[PDB]
Design a protein around this ligand. Structure first.
Ligand code: HEM
Ligand code: HEM
Lengths: 361, 362
């Protein structure tokens, strides 16, 4: 029902994947380092309250009638709902407060990729807060109240709601399906694999940026799907695009979902074949994305897709090589990357006296 | 995660307990052939019988001929019914087609202009709607997508709205949810058990004038933006004064418990509850069934929030209209703006496996 907030790492990376997401990117409006550190301490205090299911500050009610309540109160009577709050720092943060020389080399700018159609307004950001929870209202209340506490020092640049499984009805051992109808997450880094997390996910001291030890690097891509076009493709076209069948999710030529793929039996530009670590010099990612459906655009079409989130030890050796190899993905016919951001996710809050970003500031 | 029965005298999705998630879509008709449109309705009813039971539509999501697109798009495979309901409604503009003019109900009244209205015509109106409600948002999206797919060439989606969480209740024995202003929403609604109150206030009767609508209801949808920056800097007392209930318990002002009956004379003259209460409105009573929404930022550094308000009633002219007219002086108006609007006639229920949506009209 709750996920511990303190740790060597921030929660919400290797911890069990919750049903819902509210991702927000913030821009910083203050030039004052001290004022920003002050806000980081205030946010951390609020995150401790929120992730334990408590109201922020002195509560949603019961205070002085002539003061506004410390907490906006729409999460009253709800449970912690496995809420995790994960903060990250964008490269543009490091142009402020004199931090230019503290930017990790692993926090690399993404190249432009063939087919990119990035909306400037829904890309970038000085920092982000990833709020995951099984109840969407818990997640929204967290973002709503952190933005309020930070008003004057940060504004919300863009925000994305997402959903995965609904746990109260779907088995825990069942792979969820993306909105193309295919199981998603079969061959992924699991939070139980401590050795693969150390190798592929967590920043280490010898990687070159000490304040980032125990952190990770996050890539966010908002990927629209062309739903109506996908849905007119033959069942055989859809399965050819991925290299797995739609019903079971088994790699072509095998019968069970978790059978290891034979890549030579897949089409040369199949998505699994091009994404697999064997085709990328061993490059392996922790995917932790969520589906989205925002409504319908001006042409009647479903505004829906995958809010892709990948964690890795170094952007230069994780996301970049794999996405580069997708240049000829048969999937590119049906998707468009329309938003993008990268963030350095600092190490965990170690105890009650620690705070978000203490190793950097 | 069980199924809600699809057949009945009335459509499910109204007196039914309010499910966690909403996906509501409005459709414009693009065919002149009434025979084709009836065929659509029959095919949509068949799909909905599968969908509400947790089955894939048509011949399924896989296993068919490799070279054909599958009948069902597949993303609900292995999910339970999740209490899915599908409720269809007919807009006033529909009756300009297929020779239906003489059949448009009197109780399908167009809404007048209300003060403060800033309505977007792109997210308003619609020849018909489908309200998909479920506890699993993938289940709801899958149902809308597959209905639209089946209707390609005969209908198109005009506008849609997802509600990420409910702000209404038809089950007073369960916890009342809160809206994004932080107040419980749904305390004094109509309960799906109050059969006599639903007959009097919700279900259309034969005597009312339009025989094909007997057993149906009428739907008012209003998309309402909330000024959360303005709200969130108001004092606790201002917020409580605006509604007439306290924030914590949600009790009428002066009383201890959420479900104690309000004493209206103790509320401000412009309090929302005081002005909305049936006693202030000649007995006018509504079934509220709305959902909260957030659609990103506003581009100005703030979250965008609102309430997708849905009211069912026996007659728009004696339900939503008089109550909304009485909210002209509502203190809540300082914090909200109506920006989308639509009315629909919700026909009677699909009686059995041989019946179909709209059969009593067509
Ligand atoms: C709409 C966008 C995408 C969809 C629908 C999608 C879907 C899938 C599916 C169905 C699988 C097979 C099941 C699984 O192992 O999870 C898969 C595998 C994978 N995908 Fe994607 N994908 C998308 C974009 C991306 C992107 C942008 C990347 C990285 C840049 C990526 C990297 C991977 C990786 C590493 C695997 C595991 C391959 C393996 O080791 O077998 N995917 N994806
Ligand atoms: C964002 C817009 C609105 C918000 C936040 C809101 C909120 C509330 C709240 C907090 C209550 C008290 C608890 C309850 O009994 O449900 C309430 C009651 C009520 N509201 Fe609203 N409301 C909104 C719009 C409307 C509109 C547009 C109407 C009708 C046109 C309406 C009609 C009513 C009615 C009939 C009651 C029950 C009063 C009673 O019988 O005691 N509300 N509303």
């Amino acid at each position: 029902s709750a996920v511990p907030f303190h740790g060597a790492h921030q929660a919400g990376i290797a911890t069990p994947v919750q049903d819902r997401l509210h991702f927000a990117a913030f821009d910083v409006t203050t030039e004052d380092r001290a004022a920003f550190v002050a806000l980081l301490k205030e946010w951390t205090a609020a995150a401790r309250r929120l992730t334990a299911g408590h109201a922020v500050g002195e509560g949603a009610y019961g205070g002085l009638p002539e003061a506004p309540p410390d907490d906006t109160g729409e999460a009253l009577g709800l449970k912690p709902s496995r809420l995790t709050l994960t903060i990250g720092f964008g490269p543009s943060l490091f142009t402020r407060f004199g931090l230019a020389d503290l930017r990790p080399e692993a926090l690399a700018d993404l190249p432009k990729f063939p087919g990119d159609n990035l909306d400037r307004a829904r890309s970038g950001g000085d920092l982000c807060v990833q709020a995951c929870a099984d109840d969407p209202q818990v997640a929204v209340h967290a973002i709503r109240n952190l933005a309020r506490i930070g008003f004057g020092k940060v504004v919300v640049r863009w925000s994305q709601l997402g959903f995965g499984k609904t746990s109260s009805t779907t088995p825990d051992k069942q792979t969820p399906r993306n909105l193309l109808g295919f199981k998603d997450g079969t061959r992924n880094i699991a939070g139980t694999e401590k050795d693969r997390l150390d190798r592929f996910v967590w920043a280490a001291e010898k990687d070159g940026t000490p304040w980032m030890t125990g952190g990770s690097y996050l890539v966010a891509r908002r990927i629209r799907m062309h739903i109506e076009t996908w849905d007119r493709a033959s069942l055989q076209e859809q399965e050819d695009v991925f290299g797995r069948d739609k019903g079971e999710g088994a790699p072509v030529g095998k019968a069970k979902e978790r059978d290891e793929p034979f890549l030579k039996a897949m089409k040369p530009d199949a998505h699994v074949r091009l994404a697999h670590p064997d085709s990328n010099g061993g490059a392996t990612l922790l995917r932790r994305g969520y589906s989205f459906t925002d409504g319908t655009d001006g042409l009647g079409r479903l505004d829906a897709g995958l809010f892709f989130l990948a964690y890795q030890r170094d952007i230069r050796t994780g996301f970049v090589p794999v996405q580069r190899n997708l240049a000829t993905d048969a999937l590119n016919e049906y998707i468009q990357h329309v938003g993008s951001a990268v963030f350095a996710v600092p190490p965990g809050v170690r105890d009650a006296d620690d705070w978000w970003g203490s190793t950097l500031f």
